[PDB]
Design an enzyme around this catalytic site. Structure first.
Site, short mmCIF file in Angstrom:
data_model
loop_
_atom_site.label_atom_id
_atom_site.label_comp_id
_atom_site.label_asym_id
_atom_site.label_seq_id
_atom_site.Cartn_x
_atom_site.Cartn_y
_atom_site.Cartn_z
N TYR B 57 0.85 -1.18 0.00
CA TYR B 57 0.00 0.00 0.00
C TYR B 57 0.88 1.22 0.00
CZ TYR B 57 -4.97 -0.68 -0.01
OH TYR B 57 -6.25 -1.00 -0.41
N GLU B 59 -0.46 4.60 -0.44
CA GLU B 59 -1.28 5.82 -0.42
C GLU B 59 -0.38 6.99 -0.17
OE1 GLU B 59 -4.04 4.08 2.24
OE2 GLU B 59 -5.78 5.06 1.18
N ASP B 211 -5.88 14.99 -24.99
CA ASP B 211 -5.96 13.58 -24.68
C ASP B 211 -5.35 12.79 -25.84
OD1 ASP B 211 -6.59 11.00 -24.17
OD2 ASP B 211 -8.73 11.33 -24.07
N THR B 237 -3.16 7.24 -22.22
CA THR B 237 -3.30 5.94 -21.67
C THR B 237 -2.01 5.29 -22.06
OG1 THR B 237 -4.52 5.68 -23.73
CG2 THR B 237 -5.70 5.44 -21.73
N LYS B 240 -2.90 0.89 -25.56
CA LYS B 240 -3.15 1.33 -26.94
C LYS B 240 -1.84 1.48 -27.74
CE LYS B 240 -7.44 3.30 -25.76
NZ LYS B 240 -8.42 4.41 -25.64
N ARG B 246 -2.30 -1.39 -18.88
CA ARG B 246 -3.49 -0.56 -18.77
C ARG B 246 -3.37 0.37 -17.59
NH1 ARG B 246 -8.19 -1.76 -22.08
NH2 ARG B 246 -7.23 -3.43 -23.37
#
Ligand code: PLP
Ligand code: PLP
Lengths: 448, 445
Positions: B57, B59, B211, B237, B240, B246
């Protein structure tokens, strides 16, 4: 025809990118020699990581099975369906009353998503405050700043634990009448006891509200009948598939259809296309992999051991006169009230980091200011996976204590300013001696 | 004291799931994939996705974490930052990046939120002209995307030729008074006039939002107009065309707007997300190193050269295309010439192992019964296709288009009926064989 090579490199990460490989291999090893007492961390196994690495993540598959935008989604479809099925089975619910969405990318996403489907923009939601053990996506905001979108996208009121650290059903039922929200969230980050769902179910009915149950921390106990079952009472139940469930980082959103017909429609829309695009099919595959483990005797036996190790550690800690919030635990988590030793969670947190024991500062009921938290939390799911048994909690206890006493000592020698104190950890030999004992204890335990 | 976990392999532990996954790999091997938003990850990325760092974790941000034990996590997030800015040739005094968004769509709701806040005004391109759902898209039945509900959105369009209407962008912008203008699109075959947008933005003190998801790899390799020189935020992203895992990236221009860093980084956490997916950050970091190599520039080149090659073959065979060509990896065919629907051809092509998807055309008003299709060359390129192979692809489509007109005449105009035609049909059985032998032949990562 005359061969022309693909335009890629399929060599190993070691050859292909040495720099990253090294950093990662240093993490795997740092993991091995650490006593992980973080209640929300766990270890995934081979099968789950294998799915996460699967080529099925190449496939774009927006939509739901048999309703997909692109074609070529037959095996994707069969897998998502296998996921719904294993998910339902894992919690003893039936496709008739209950349905599930397995496309959320994490818990926070699952939560925002399920919340919005239920409430809409600037709808009214109610959940426990953070410092008392709620999650940020339960509507947390502090002072001027709306910290969680759940606070900004929605109108959120926050309820609290009493002084003994329990949820005040009265204070819950009050705000419910007063703020009169459209959804009441329970299920908590760092609450050491079971949740009275029957209770919340009634308060919700008085006010004609949705009952929302976030079991990310305790999902496995629910599954194994070791805690109350929210699925008897709740309209929506979400969970992270990581943490105690020991799956990939992903989440589930279960919905009660018999209580709200055509709620499925509402949940699904929110996930895609309201919030998300293409699912991560490897996450899905990985989650299906783990849900099958969950419905297993070996997993039931692991779950109980988590509970048994936790309560065991609580005994050990109470036997040494440590003061525990709520004075015990119904589950895998425990919160230590540290003010008796005139030491902050923060300080202790750094002490344990410095000796390869990982835990985290927590809040006791009486800290109004989340600034200076006075407690710590600790959980047994990671150690249990690694083979620790009840007798192994003695050692953990002795160490924490040793760690508490070393915290007061340095605190005084170097000051109560975290910056100063923090430097007492850098060149101390009393700390290299504990780290050694720790690292050797840890290196020895099995590792997934 | 044995650990309480089963580390057996997937074949043994979960043969049912293992089987489906295998069936999946071979479906991929034996398919001619023309889906412009799909590519193939290589061994190292997938190694990273399975890496145990996901157990941790994290965070918070490097050196600003909640929990301890994030030394290597921090090293790696930072390495990701470095390789990111490096990949798009911008500088860390000028530009910052956030590597935590779990997907493209999240990167967009987060960034937008950080820039305009609740009920802020954003302007984007209409879905049917190639804007993404996250660009503010609403129907008039529903607010389809949260981006249309949480923000106030206005959609701009393209003209009858399929080009972005710069003047229409600029009228709407003066009337609407939006704070963010989005450009960068899903199914647009040309390059974008960022400079035009930067102008139309100032004149209304809006943020220029690019984008670059579909075209990311080109920008990196300077084969397309670079949004970096003119934009306030750039999102992409990492999957692609960029061929990573991803995840997503938000890139922000500090110099254009100081203190932007807090707004973006707070939007991602704790406004929207929680613990990051450290496998993903790793695998992004892994793939951004590949992007910055001759081999990957050599790759992007081929993607482009194959695209234009394919547009030439298609044009010689007298198909009609929006914009009459492509400046990138994508091509949209206008199917009206054949009185055929994108759906039907989509179906015909699946039946014969060719993947591609229906796409609307400027004449169309709906997402249903769209008149065209979309094809892209990133994946075939990866699989070692060259310009000479676009001729095979072109004939094969032409066959499909013909067989679609044929089946339409025979089995009926309603899709339900038509779908019925594709079953036990030997002209299809035969094409499938042709396609499978060809596809099965190519390299597969
Ligand atoms: C950790 C947690 C979440 C959110 O988890 P992500 O890190 O966003 O996947 C949600 N609910 C509870 C109760 C949690 O503990
Ligand atoms: C695909 C895409 C997205 C969203 O990405 P997901 O990972 O599917 O959420 C956003 N923007 C553009 C331009 C895209 O093509």
């Amino acid at each position: 025809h005359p061969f022309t090579p693909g335009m890629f490199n399929n060599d190993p990460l070691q050859k292909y990118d040495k720099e990253l490989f090294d950093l990662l291999e240093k993490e795997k090893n740092r993991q091995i020699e650490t006593i992980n007492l973080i209640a929300s961390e766990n270890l995934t196994n081979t099968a789950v990581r294998e799915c996460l690495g699967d080529r099925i993540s190449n496939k774009y598959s927006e939509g739901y099975p048999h309703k997909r935008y692109y074609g070529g989604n037959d095996y994707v479809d069969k897998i998502e369906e296998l996921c719904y099925k294993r998910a339902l089975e894992a919690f003893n619910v039936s496709e008739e009353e209950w349905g599930v969405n397995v496309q959320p990318l994490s818990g926070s996403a699952a939560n925002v998503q399920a919340l919005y489907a239920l409430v809409g923009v600037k709808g009214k939601i109610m959940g426990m405050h953070l410092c008392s053990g709620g999650h940020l996506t339960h509507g947390f905001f502090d002072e001027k700043k709306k910290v969680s979108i759940t606070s900004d996208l929605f109108e959120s009121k926050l309820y609290k634990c009493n002084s003994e650290g329990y949820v005040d059903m009265e204070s819950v039922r009050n705000l419910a009448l007063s703020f009169q929200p459209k959804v009441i969230i329970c299920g908590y980050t760092s609450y050491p006891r079971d949740i009275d769902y029957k209770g919340f179910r009634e308060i919700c009915d008085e006010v004609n509200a949705y009952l929302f149950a976030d079991i990310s921390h305790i999902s496995s106990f629910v599954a194994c009948n070791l805690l109350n079952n929210p699925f008897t009472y709740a309209d929506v139940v979400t969970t992270t598939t990581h943490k105690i469930l020991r799956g990939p980082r992903s989440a589930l959103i279960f919905f009660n259809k018999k209580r709200n017909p055509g709620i499925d429609q509402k949940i699904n829309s929110s996930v895609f296309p309201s919030f998300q695009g293409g699912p991560h099919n490897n996450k899905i595959a990985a989650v299906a992999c783990q849900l099958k483990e969950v419905n297993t005797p070996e997993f039931k036996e692991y779950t109980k051991q988590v509970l048994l190790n936790s309560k065991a550690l609580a005994e050990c800690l109470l036997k040494r006169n440590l003061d525990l919030v709520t004075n015990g635990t119904d589950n895998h988590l425990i919160v230590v009230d540290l003010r008796k030793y005139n030491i902050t969670g923060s300080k202790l947190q750094e002490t344990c980091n410095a000796i390869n024991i990982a835990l985290n500062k927590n809040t006791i009921p009486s800290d109004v200011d989340c600034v200076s938290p006075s407690g710590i939390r600790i959980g047994t799911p990671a150690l249990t996976t690694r083979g620790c048994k009840e007798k192994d909690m003695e050692f953990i206890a002795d160490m924490l204590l040793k760690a508490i006493l070393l915290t007061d000592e340095l605190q005084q020698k170097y000051g109560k300013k975290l910056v100063d104190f923090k430097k007492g950890l850098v060149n101390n030999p009393k700390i290299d001696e504990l780290k050694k004992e720790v690292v050797q204890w840890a290196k020895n335990l099995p590792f997934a």
